[PDB]
Amino acid sequence: GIGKFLHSAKKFGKAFVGEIMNS
After folding, report:
1. Residue 7 C-beta-side C-alpha neighbours within 13 Å
2. Can you count the helices (H) and strands (E) in the chain?
3. Which residues contact 13 (CB under 8 A, 6 or more apart)?
4. How is 1-21 classified by DSSP, letter by letter?
């Protein structure tokens, strides 16, 4: 699913952003 994965990429991404924002 080259769609859901991407979806996760986003979400997970956000989560990542949050990690950087708050380490």
Report:
1. 4
2. 1, 0
3. none
4. -TTHHHHHHHHHHHHHHHHHH
Q: What are the percentages of helix, strand and coil residues in the chain, rounded to 5?
A: 80, 0, 20
Whole-angstrom Cα distance, residue 10 to residue 3? 11
Residue type (1 letter), 22: N
> What span, in angstroms and rounded, lies between the C-alpha atoms of 23 and 19?
5
Residue 1 sits at the vertex; the CA angle it makes with 12 and 6, to the nearest 5 degrees, is 30
